[PDB]
Design a protein around this ligand. Sequence first.
Ligand SMILES: NC(=O)c1ccc[n+]([C@@H]2O[C@H](COP(=O)([O-])OP(=O)(O)OC[C@H]3O[C@@H](n4cnc5c(N)ncnc54)[C@H](OP(=O)(O)O)[C@@H]3O)[C@@H](O)[C@H]2O)c1
Ligand SMILES: NC(=O)c1ccc[n+]([C@@H]2O[C@H](COP(=O)([O-])OP(=O)(O)OC[C@H]3O[C@@H](n4cnc5c(N)ncnc54)[C@H](OP(=O)(O)O)[C@@H]3O)[C@@H](O)[C@H]2O)c1
Lengths: 354, 354
Amino acid sequence: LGSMKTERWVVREHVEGVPDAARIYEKVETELNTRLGEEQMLLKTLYVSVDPYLQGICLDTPIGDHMGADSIMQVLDAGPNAPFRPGDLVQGFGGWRTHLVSDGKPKLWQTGTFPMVFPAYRKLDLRHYDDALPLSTALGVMGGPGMTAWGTMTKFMQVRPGDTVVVSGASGMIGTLVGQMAKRAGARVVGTAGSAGKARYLSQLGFDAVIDYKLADDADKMREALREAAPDGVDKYFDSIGGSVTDAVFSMLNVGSQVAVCWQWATQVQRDYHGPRLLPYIMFPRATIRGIFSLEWFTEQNWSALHEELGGLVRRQELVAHETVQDGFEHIPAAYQTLFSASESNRGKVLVRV
Amino acid sequence: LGSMKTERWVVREHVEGVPDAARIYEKVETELNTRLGEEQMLLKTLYVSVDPYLQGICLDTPIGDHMGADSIMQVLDAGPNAPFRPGDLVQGFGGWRTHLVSDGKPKLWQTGTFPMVFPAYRKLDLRHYDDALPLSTALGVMGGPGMTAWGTMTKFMQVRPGDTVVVSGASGMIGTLVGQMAKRAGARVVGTAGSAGKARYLSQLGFDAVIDYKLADDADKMREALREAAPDGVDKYFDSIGGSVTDAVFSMLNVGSQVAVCWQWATQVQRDYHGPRLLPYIMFPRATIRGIFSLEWFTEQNWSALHEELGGLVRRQELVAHETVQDGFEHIPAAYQTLFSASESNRGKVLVRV
Ligand SMILES: NC(=O)c1ccc[n+]([C@@H]2O[C@H](COP(=O)([O-])OP(=O)(O)OC[C@H]3O[C@@H](n4cnc5c(N)ncnc54)[C@H](OP(=O)(O)O)[C@@H]3O)[C@@H](O)[C@H]2O)c1
Ligand SMILES: NC(=O)c1ccc[n+]([C@@H]2O[C@H](COP(=O)([O-])OP(=O)(O)OC[C@H]3O[C@@H](n4cnc5c(N)ncnc54)[C@H](OP(=O)(O)O)[C@@H]3O)[C@@H](O)[C@H]2O)c1
């Protein structure tokens, strides 16, 4: 019954470390077969998300295949048993593609270091979004990133007023969201930034102390900045970076503390594969480290709560949830490259509109 | 008015690594003032414990002072407000000494890496003991070690039937305790031994698989031995060893897994301070690692419970809890040295009768 011309960003080359987007990615035109299966449905991408964790998926993506990504899609056309009818807005791992055909079921990430099943698509009810909480928040504070932050702070971390909370890679959306909730629950918040621009930005949001991780290239010099910024010890660590800062924070864990390992920038991107053993430090404090893989929380009730609980605070200016929306499908890898650029140009989540 | 001659083992020299007990320790004669205060007590040591963690306390024990140690002591004489009357059996950190004076109160370990409060002495009620669970069990299955194992299995680890539980340093008393409770909870249990003597000992008691960590000083054959022993992945890791075995186990953590870090022989004893970054492996499996410091559990309700839950199983021959009782105060470091001996002639908990 027909086909259609579509643009895709495919994985051209595997490069370790801080990526070179123009070298890694290639826009191709690709003929998309439009004869939908029993439960398949033809989707139009409206927004794609650009995220640092994609640095890993790219290395596990077969050369020539399209680049995965959280996206917002519209149902152009749907097969007889599809989960959504034409017109429905949906969220899922659509990728850097203009159009795609999918049955919307949980697919498995076969070529992955860890076998992973991507979540089945979720429908968006447009009634939830307006100019203070736009639809693009479904890829940020009302989607993947917000669910990560909200999930950790309500289902794992119990922040007592007086606790000192350290957030690494704080300047991004998950770290700023986490820290602000910690400020709200009565915590001293310590964050980490890479420039003065981000450092004063995190200050506004209410971070009591911000450490320049680039100035503290050393793990000892990072341990001193940490000793003074958190004079009474760390009670909660929300870790996105790893490397020498987690080595530093783990040397100062209070009793009963809780670490949340969310990502490890320092090992994925900058390849800090060997370092001091951190496990000895957790024995006396009875510290609980927990890995975060927020997909587990992608359920209907959770999405409901995330809107009511968190969404209110965002629209009432009680919680800042910034976003930087470039425009144009052609500029997606450009937009992605900014995540590794030292410029102070990012606030919150980065999205592309198509 | 009153004094008493008492022998004490004092710390002559600090030596790092596998200890040289004959070189580190020294039997001295010590005149003990027996004129007790109104709430003090003169105590006689009946049994002393030798434990691999003493290697750490010995290095933090100021030169010339007595070597700390868990002991079982009897009240020779007590002031009018003492917490215990004469004849009473108590358990506490009496040390490698024949006689001592104490208020039985929580002493603080100033000279420690982490400020640590030694627990106040606990009274031993002889009704609790019999010919299958003798008085010496208060330093083993009915004391510190048993509280560690039972504490972790009842207050942290939830072993579901089918899980594969890996216990490192299994041949000792905490490790054998932990494995048998996982075996009883429906787990395939994997342990680690250094000789066929230890491994076949672990074979009896019910370990489905035993790994020769000495054959695999390298992590490559260690990750292979684990792949074979745990073909379906690790769900529960009870870690006493650390080092390249924990490196191997972290590469095969299933979803929802739980590590319990209890000690790190390879870092304390063998100085394995550096290794592969393990926190990256805990993200996707949503693993919860937790540090163990069983002092937190030394409360009366817990002690009642340890006798009820654990003590019953031992008395009903459902749980083997072996112990190796050296005799003679003169031999305390001799008995201590066997813990670090490359020969594996010791089974269960090691005590001296004095
Ligand atoms: N586990 C999950 O389910 C899950 C879900 C979504 C995302 N994630 C991952 O978790 C991370 C947290 O999200 P996010 O929004 O907070 O991302 P993010 O802040 O953009 O993460 C990178 C930030 O960390 C800082 N940084 C970069 N390199 C660094 C280094 N070498 N040392 C110290 N700090 C460095 C940078 O701060 P400056 O701006 O100051 O340079 C940068 O803004 C993301 O990277 C994402 O990939 C995990
Ligand atoms: N966190 C706490 O509060 C707490 C409380 C009490 C005790 N602990 C610690 O927990 C440990 C376990 O208690 P336990 O009484 O059952 O002691 P343990 O098992 O005797 O501890 C060491 C055991 O591991 C094995 N081992 C020795 N060297 C090894 C190596 N290089 N690699 C791998 N395995 C090795 C030994 O068996 P082989 O004969 O096979 O060498 C030995 O039986 C103790 O060592 C103690 O220090 C912690």
